[PDB]
Amino acid sequence: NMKERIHEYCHRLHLPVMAERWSAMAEYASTHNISYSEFLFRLLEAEIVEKQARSIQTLIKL
DNA sequence: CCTTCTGGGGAATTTTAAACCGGCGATTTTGGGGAAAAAATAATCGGCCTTGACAGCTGCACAGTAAGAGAATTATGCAGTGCTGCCATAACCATGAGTGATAACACTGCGGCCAACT
């Protein structure tokens, strides 16, 4: 199906965040009118928020 | 007594039969090509007719000559040792040439560090 392959690719790119955020943003856009560009913008926003949180945690760990 | 008729023979001419040679029309024969059929030769198939073997197994004996295996004996080639002489090599200095090295930039290999998944 589509969801399983999406999650596969997301994890292969090291983006379980992508699997999680795509669910939320997809639900929101299906419940709203989000142009594909804005949907992608929200996707990248969530990805980089989680990525920056992880990077800060790793730096503090070091 | 005389006249007319007839017959034989030699020469000239005509016709028909026979034989040869040539010309003309027909069949035959030779050559080549294509197709069909027959026969010859080789290979493959089935089957009948006839008989050998299976019945403990073959190792040994003698004949003569030659080969070979083992042991003893002998010959010879290698090695070992001493003394003397000759040839090679090695040691030094000089000069030339080749290669290992050094500087600089570019590309690649290896080790340290960071992150992602189980």
From Swiss-Prot:
Any GO molecular function: ATP hydrolysis activity
Annotated keywords: ATP-binding, Nucleotide-binding, Transposable element
Keyword Nucleotide-binding: yes
Protein name: Insertion sequence IS5376 putative ATP-binding protein
Family assignment from sequence similarity: Belongs to the IS21/IS1162 putative ATP-binding protein family.
GO BP, one annotated term: DNA replication
Parent-protein residues present: 1 to 61 of 251
